[PDB]
Design a binder for this molecule. Structure first.
Ligand code: HEM
Ligand code: HEM
Ligand SMILES: CN(C)Cc1cccc(NCc2ccc3ccc(N)nc3c2)c1
Ligand SMILES: CN(C)Cc1cccc(NCc2ccc3ccc(N)nc3c2)c1
Ligand SMILES: C[C@H](O)[C@H](O)[C@H]1CNc2nc(N)[nH]c(=O)c2N1
Ligand SMILES: C[C@H](O)[C@H](O)[C@H]1CNc2nc(N)[nH]c(=O)c2N1
Ligand SMILES: [Zn+2]
Lengths: 411, 407
């Protein structure tokens, strides 16, 4: 079978055969589309076909499908599964798996870079302190004095589901949020629940607007432990605007390294519940979402005031106007400090090229339009006009519930 | 089977049961989502009629009534006999309003019940169609105080006697390909601006030439008619800050009047049912003015603002895009022509959603279309989960007549 996508701006038509390799479910049906829904202990039974599917893909990619090496590896895995109930990935397979999970992330606009991921194998790790050490090295390596490098650190896979490694932070580096008795919020409103947990766990909060949160690290199903990332490892950028001199006086800054740490990496049926990864920011992530979401720092107002815009009628588009200047400031500050960042025009343009390349070399590129289109200026980017097919391929990054909701406390 | 949708800005969760009524297909499957794809006999007829009359008679609290049963009987009789049937005026109006109510891509549906329905089912000729269309335009325009309306021409019979409005909208600007290589006027209508000429139109080969109407009655050859200029409300576009803005020479029409869709009620097909409401500002300023395959003036505007157009990261396109949209809204508001900004419309839509979930058990919605083409995430709809499904009565897309016309 074939499915075709059309770019309504260029009339370029592409043919998807890759979606046929998709097994997992979308959430949609013939009668309903769940395309804008944010989110729509495994037995030996269902594990070998998953391992086999993976090993087939792996051996095809290295042009050794049906080889004796391919076949021996299948046999090896089979025996280990029926003997030990799970199996270990070779280093090669781990690296391949991690890159492909990223290549397969249909909501990621940054995928042109997928083949350049530095994989850090942390499967020999056994304690939270050990986790802290690995994560520190990840941060130093990824940061690279502002010349950011994509990386992922992979902690031991799940076994019985009772010995999970988890990073409790949603991102390695994030600012604290504090609910005040008067109802207002100090710092990042997105991080209030997590900040509270940390504080309870014994964290001494400075209680400022930009306190970098401690790491809360869980090894082998044990109670999580608190660690402070050395501040010299946390690259930060003071936000200023190139024409507006008052902008620096808003007192804003942001961290340089986006490092998502709460996702689950699935490879050949194995589950890596702790797999923090990092790339670099698209400016809108900070400038639109982090600063201007009503449920975040929400500084549109104060910015708009200082711009002396007509804030009386929404049809003045003061909100839109302040949004742009804020995003200008984010990009300006980062470039000025030589910290890797990409604007949404550059990123989307790159993604279209990646996407076309993927259709040709791979037979498709799964892509989630709802997430791929930038949160501002949508139609003036080329992805807006691009039809996309969304489907699930493995290896993959999956959501998992927050650990504080599932964890059995030891004390 | 009972679905919930969460708003992530407010944590408001709504429960959808309305989707269980859904009858048509979405394009998606369990293995693939097609959410961003733009377009993915006697026997057939009676259940379709029945389903409609059921929901109609329920809507007036007369489900399970003599009238209901009798109407069902009567329609059933008429089908067995005539191989089709005719809607009562009441059912026609209800059907039209509900097609709009069910338009999952329409952000403006809070106004769905206030639609003025014009029954043009007695029409027999293009001249007649022209008359009905002029009346629609004048009524809807209302000297700038726009009123929503739909005009419904005779239903399909056997696909041979089709009533069609060949324009995509009643009022659109011409587009001609130059030898220069570029395009004068509107690039989207170049093919149509051609067909008008090819069927006899005299283009003023200007830029903002209001296109003539191309009207097709009873399956016959389509005819050209010029809408009286005094019926075409236009708005000159100026900026409330940049006085150089006027010299760009931009204007736009006040009346968005979509004329190429198919209206389906109770199994019956209305191939000609032009309808109109009023613009959201971004339709003109973001899409019409700044789309690359359209008027594409971003560059020119940025120049006049002397923005650093050297690197993308200066966000010059973004800055210009805003100013343009500020001007659009400004011009329309100044000239007292109805228009809505994307903030007001999306906020209205969230409230309409809440109303629909309350009084109806849900509201089919296409996030890809509902989220405005600029400043998406600072509008409430961006953070709103939506469920997309097809309900009937509905507006459907249909093939362009020229690819089909048995001349
Ligand atoms: C290197 C530069 C990168 C850029 C510019 C980038 C950009 C983005 C953006 C803007 C999003 C949307 C998230 C949001 O707006 O909330 C996203 C999602 C995502 N990215 Fe990338 N990314 C990069 C690297 C990576 C890497 C290295 C990985 C993994 C190894 C990755 C995996 C993912 C995944 C799994 C999602 C989906 C997350 C979700 O479903 O919530 N990305 N990316
Ligand atoms: C009264 C004020 C109205 C507003 C502000 C409004 C707004 C919109 C917008 C912005 C779109 C997206 C289209 C695009 O971006 O190109 C849309 C789609 C749509 N609207 Fe509304 N609209 C209004 C009235 C109406 C009326 C009166 C009808 C029918 C009686 C209608 C039926 C539809 C349909 C069927 C679509 C989807 C068409 C498609 O799938 O391409 N709208 N509307
Ligand atoms: C919710 N968790 C998946 C963690 C989390 C917290 C806050 C924001 C996001 N965004 C998803 C996401 C995932 C990977 C990314 C990689 C690079 C980048 N610049 N942004 C990225 C964004 C993700
Ligand atoms: C090509 N067909 C889908 C019809 C067509 C032609 C031109 C534009 C559009 N946009 C869809 C559409 C439909 C109804 C609308 C009603 C009011 C409004 N402001 N925009 C509206 C926009 C639709
Ligand atoms: C490819 C994509 O489906 C296409 O550009 C859609 C996206 N969203 C849209 N949204 C609206 N309101 N109008 C449109 O024409 C489109 N076009
Ligand atoms: C309801 C909706 O699915 C939700 O707000 C999504 C929309 N698209 C998004 N797109 C990106 N890149 N990031 C997001 O957080 C979201 N949120
Ligand atoms: Zn879908």
């Amino acid at each position: 079978r074939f499915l075709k996508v059309k770019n309504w701006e260029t009339d370029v038509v592409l043919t998807d055969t890759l979606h046929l390799k998709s097994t997992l479910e979308t959430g949609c049906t013939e009668h309903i589309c769940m395309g804008s829904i944010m989110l729509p202990v495994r037995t030996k039974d269902q594990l070998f076909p998953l391992a086999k599917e993976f090993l087939d893909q792996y051996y095809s990619s290295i042009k050794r499908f049906g080889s004796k090496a391919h076949m021996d590896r299948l046999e090896e895995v089979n025996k280990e599964i029926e003997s030990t109930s799970t199996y270990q990935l070779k280093d090669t397979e781990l690296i391949y798996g991690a890159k492909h999970a990223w290549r397969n992330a249909s909501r990621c606009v940054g995928r042109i870079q997928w083949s350049k991921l530095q994989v850090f194998d942390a499967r020999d790790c056994t304690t939270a302190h050990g986790m802290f050490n690995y994560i520190c090295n990840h941060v130093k390596y990824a940061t690279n004095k502002g010349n950011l490098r994509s990386a992922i650190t992979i902690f031991p896979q799940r076994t019985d589901g009772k010995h999970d490694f988890r990073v409790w932070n949603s991102q390695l580096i994030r600012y604290a949020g504090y609910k005040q008795p008067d109802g207002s919020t100090l710092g990042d409103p997105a991080n209030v629940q997590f900040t509270e947990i940390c504080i309870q766990q014994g964290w001494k909060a400075p209680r400022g607007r930009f306190d970098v949160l401690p790491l809360l690290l869980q090894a082998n199903g044990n109670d999580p432990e608190l660690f402070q990332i050395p501040p010299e490892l946390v690259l930060e950028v003071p936000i200023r605007h190139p024409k507006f001199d008052w902008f620096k006086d808003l007192g804003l800054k942001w961290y340089g390294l986006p490092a998502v740490s709460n996702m689950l990496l699935e490879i050949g049926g194995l589950e890596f519940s702790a797999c923090p990864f990092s790339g670099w920011y698209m400016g809108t992530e900070i400038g639109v979402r982090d600063y201007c979401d009503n449920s975040r720092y929400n500084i549109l107002e104060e910015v708009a005031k200082k711009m002396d815009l007509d804030m009386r009628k929404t049809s003045s588009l003061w909100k839109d106007q302040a949004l742009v200047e804020i995003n200008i400031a984010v990009l300006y500050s980062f470039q000025s400090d030589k910290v890797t960042i990409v604007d949404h025009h550059s990123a989307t343009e790159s993604f279209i090229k990646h996407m076309e390349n993927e259709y040709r070399c791979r037979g498709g590129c799964p892509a989630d339009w709802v997430w791929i289109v930038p949160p501002m200026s949508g139609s003036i980017t080329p992805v807006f006009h691009q039809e996309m097919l969304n489907y699930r391929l493995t290896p993959s990054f999956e959501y998992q519930p927050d650990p504080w909701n599932t964890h059995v406390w030891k004390g």
